[PDB]
């Protein structure tokens, strides 16, 4: 009847004990908590990442790791989970979510504010949860489980770091509530088949410039920004999409697009969508070969730019996939 | 017994007329002739619409100082100031504002509205309506920036959303709460009154890199940011204010202190603060900005550039509270 | 392409002056303030009651009296808009929603806690939006509008009262919040038309107990709530419906509903459907009010005792959906 | 050394199996054996499953003394209580102890839960675990009540949501402290404040009080009915801020009501809200006839208070001024 879930803990202080480091073997023997072994609860092993991956340290061969960990366990699990740290699961999150072509088991990212074995940790929800989630109710996409919600992987950010942290999906509601009861919200399919075979597409790391507006920020600064080796650009903007409007800097970044440099435009607020094109912003940002980011989050504009520029693509596939949603990282 | 506040309107969407929304020479003043702003319980108020107005997207630091320097010369003819502005940049021109002001005696209120005054529905109705109310009723000694029915400190302030456009105060709560009654905040006290004289210090622009971090970032990309001529570096990092051990980029931030450049450590995080130690950011000369607003460190970062002081001051006083900004 | 709404004042603050009371022809002296007088906004008919109705001291002729105003100016305007005072605004909401039938244009129930006349008024963003909404959005029901959202007239309750008066739907969205935009909720439909006549079915005062139920209660105590006139028996019990076991209480229900009297089971909770199916109350008489607020069980029980029906038409139809008042 | 928690359990979801929902003897107790439970920073517990279980819609005003007589005969024996109970009525019951009990230097949390401990992701066990963290760790010497991940007055609790998600509420009130990933305290809220003489429990029976919800039109005949004897307390719902219809003949049934000795307060059937009969708000039509205020009490706080002192052997008048007097929190003004 049950389920089989894979636990890839890679890090993080979830699997930490106190008086507060990472001990080798700990998290697999702490898992002797009974509730995870109810025949309600699927069957789990769980593998301890050998190094094991501190959050803010990572890097895209860390991606990689996970990812290949992932590929090969795929025939033989039905869903899994990936324990990481906070400071950077949303990053990670991201990244997987576009590695991943064809993904059609769950994928769940969660981990903890406090260590699983603390009294009161937020592991046990979130590692039961997670558990249950994978098991009773598969959503076939990388996910990003925290705050008794899961949320799309691609969506989340971290809101909070405080006593209470939490990440959040303000441009896509959460695909499910952990509550008293669990609810699927109304866009989303349990078990999506998906088209094609599965496949990890490789990502290697990409010298991206992310460089906030702010008034009267020079072309000097933003030139800089642009020298090689950078590769691409992902400009943050006021409102729904407004750079100033300075000859000079808008002529750096059109020089830059024609050195086959892509120039990304997110908005610098919380929750909303960039409106290029015509009429809510002008055609300053366009004309300059600069392309909308929609209402991307800034972790999904980083790793679609690092999954596409890690193919080999020309500049102007890069450019337009940029601009189609591929794994529902934003909508228009 | 009565107040009379003076209105700047600077520019912003809220003295604009619908079209296929552009601005209209002198609306706004004609307009703010209904009746519930003319009434024994409100203030007197007075209009100055800028020549040219200021599109909020295009705004640099010497608007900035037009913007005081109006303040500044009609300080003692007034008793509080509300100065409209379009929402996209509001959040710094109001940071910019607290820092340039010494000794604010009166209440400065920024605010706007996301629909023109002269449609049905504006929100900018009762956010004018309120912000005179408030300036003359409850003024608050600060620069201030109120939307969405609340009173923000305007250091702490942010554009959090671009529908339904939204300001949170993401580490300060509200000053002050404006729903069927005013309430005001228990941290907070009306008309404190300011030690010395009032005065605008300058501003000009400085060349501040913002750089985000993420996962296997360059030095290289570093580097190229911290090239001559950038002054300052704020680095948005993850979680309580942890970078990449990785060396190369510590050296990098490092050589760039040592030539001078401040640089300052704020998260990527809508709240919370940087909590800096054996710490490999603080020796390689980076400094704490505990819980500002991206917009607060630029500017303080601006106003503490633009004054005429060495490395060690402009060093030492980031890391002083000046006007709220930030606690710790 | 404009529309002509409608508006009776009955009563309320919303039409008053301050002291330390309400004046004959205020309101409509008030109504000149130029928003209302503007081409986007409908044109509007006022009327004032004589004599102006209490909210507290209001009876089913007082209902009726509204009903027969509305019948009275049915054919001549495009919706309706009555002024109401807060305390029993719930009530006579829900009461008008059972009284007419193939309603073809908004009602909206609305008033306010601070006068139309005071400064920073609730009244004039209610007012406001109420014509708004009727002219832009209508809406065939009885609606109450209040705190920014229209609401299901027999659905909606006053959950506080004090310095910050406020209704909920708490078992049903609301139909239409009005924030900066007007958004429609999802099973909402803008002018659905009506299959047959309008008219007005009249209410009767109806001698309905209430018993809220308590451990122990005594069924001594809920014999003497049950003795005549009473004709219907509002019982509200705990959670999902439960009441105690006790049998003498059990029989003093069964005897009521044996000689003819109503008895149905209302939850305490404010956000709580009833669920019954050999169940004792059941067995007992007891009918499921399913997720009914107390205000639209009264108004369903005076409407249909109002109608000299049989016992167990009226027993048949208090489990029928008339009015959207209940998900069964 | 470690602090000891007793625990009663007296019926209700969290100590059930589910079926084709039952009761089972000694299941919580089994139960009770998960880790979780037994670690250093936890309290010791002793748990007692009464016999027979109460079922919570059943209670009466008899088993709330059973569960005070319970509590005084251990009240030496631990440092804390909690109380395992039904929903259905455990505000009614938290609002009873809190009367009963005098001079309480000892927490007394009332919890339970929507789905049995046994049955998978059970709110009941962060409800248990944390009620005897917060118990030993944060004691707050009065009646409580845990759920939702927040400890509320007791007396100043009702079931607000009853569904797939339950829930309580202290409307007028905020809750005294916050179990999130943080244990957060209110303030002018004080850890371990000891009381001002020995603790004691206070007698309770049944009493004969009818309760009224106003609505437009109410007869004076209905209200009639409601005031035969055996009635000695009635409870009025009103409008607003206190507001009734001021017929005459209901005025006057009011007054003959509380002329011959039957006690008649006023709370609001508003939510959050309090009565103010202060003659400015809504008049003095009330206060003539006899009625008292019962300013932001709840139904439940009402219900209780009223039967702790009309079970005292309290004269007419002494009843009328304790209502109207703060006595555990319940109220302000």
Redesign the interface.
């Known amino acids: 009847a049950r389920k089989h879930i894979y636990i890839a803990y890679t890090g993080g202080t979830i699997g930490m004990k106190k008086s507060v480091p990472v001990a080798g073997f700990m998290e697999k023997q702490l898992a002797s908590?009974?509730?995870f072994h109810?025949p309600?609860?699927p069957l789990f092993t769980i593998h301890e990442y050998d190094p094991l991956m501190?959050?803010?340290?990572?890097?895209?061969?860390?991606?990689q790791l996970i990812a290949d960990d992932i590929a090969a366990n795929y025939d033989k699990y039905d869903g899994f989970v990936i324990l990481h740290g906070?400071?950077?699961m949303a990053?990670?999150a991201s990244?997987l979510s576009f590695m991943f072509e064809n993904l059609g088991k769950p994928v769940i990212v969660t981990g903890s504010?406090?260590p699983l074995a603390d009294?009161?940790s937020?592991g046990q929800?979130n590692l039961?949860?997670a558990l249950?989630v994978a098991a009773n109710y598969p959503i076939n996409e990388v996910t990003l489980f925290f705050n008794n919600r899961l949320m799309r992987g691609n969506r989340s950010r971290?809101?909070?770091?405080?006593?209470?942290?939490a990440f959040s999906s303000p441009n896509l509601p959460p695909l499910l509530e952990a509550?008293?009861?669990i609810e699927l919200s109304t866009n989303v399919k349990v078990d999506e088949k998906p088209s094609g075979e599965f496949k990890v597409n490789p990502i290697t790391?990409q010298?991206?410039?992310?460089?906030?507006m702010?008034?009267?920020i020079?072309h000097?600064?933003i030139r800089?920004?642009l020298?090689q080796?950078?590769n691409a650009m992902i400009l943050?903007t006021?409102?729904?999409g407004?750079?100033?409007?300075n000859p000079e800097l808008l002529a750096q970044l059109k020089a830059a697009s024609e050195r086959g440099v892509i120039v990304v435009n997110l908005?610098?607020?919380?929750?909303?969508?960039v409106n290029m094109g015509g009429y809510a912003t002008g055609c300053a940002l366009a004309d300059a070969g600069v392309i909308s980011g929609y209402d991307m989050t800034?972790e999904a504009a980083?790793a679609k730019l690092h999954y596409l520029l890690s193919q080999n693509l020309s500049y102007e596939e890069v450019k337009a996939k940029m601009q189609q949603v591929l794994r529902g990282e934003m909508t228009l």
Not at 242 to 245: G, W, Y
Not at 267 to 273: H, I, N, R, V, Y
């Open positions: 908590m009974p509730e109810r309600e609860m501190d959050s803010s340290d990572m890097t895209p061969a860390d991606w906070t400071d950077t990053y990670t990244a504010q406090i009294l009161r937020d929800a039961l949860n249950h971290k809101s909070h770091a405080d006593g209470f942290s509550g008293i009861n790391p010298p991206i410039g992310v460089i906030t702010y008034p009267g020079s000097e600064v800089n920004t020298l080796p950078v943050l006021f409102g729904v407004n750079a100033p409007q908005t610098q607020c919380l929750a909303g969508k800034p980083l």
